[PDB]
């Protein structure tokens, strides 16, 4: 079988725009893009955790990773978007 993020980007695209469609090439572009971004932040967080003699990837590690990787403004929303989910995830 094959794995992809095609359904989730379709859902978020329908959420941000109710009547806009997406082609097949743009689907693969977004798939490869999100895979590359995920790999970059995961590898960077792994290097940071190995730097600080840590063996667990706690949410603080990837927070510092995305704060270091992403530019200045986007990170200001990124850290504002992750914790808001985490604080919801701990609501159970």
């Amino acid at each position: 079988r094959k794995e992809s993020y095609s359904v989730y980007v379709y859902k978020v695209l329908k959420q941000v725009h109710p009547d806009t469609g997406i082609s097949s090439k743009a689907m693969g572009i977004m798939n490869s893009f999100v895979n590359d971004i995920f790999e970059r932040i995961a590898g960077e967080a792994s290097r940071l955790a190995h730097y600080n003699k840590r063996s667990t990837i706690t949410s603080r590690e990837i927070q510092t990773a995305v704060r270091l990787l992403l530019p200045g403004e986007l990170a200001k929303h990124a850290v504002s978007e992750g914790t808001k989910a985490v604080t919801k995830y701990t609501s159970s």
Binding site: K2, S4, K25, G28, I29, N31, S32, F33, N35, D36
Partner: peptide, 8 residues
């Protein structure tokens, strides 16, 4: 120089 679209 990464290239998107064909990776998958």
């Amino acid at each position: 120089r990464t290239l998107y679209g064909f990776g998958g």
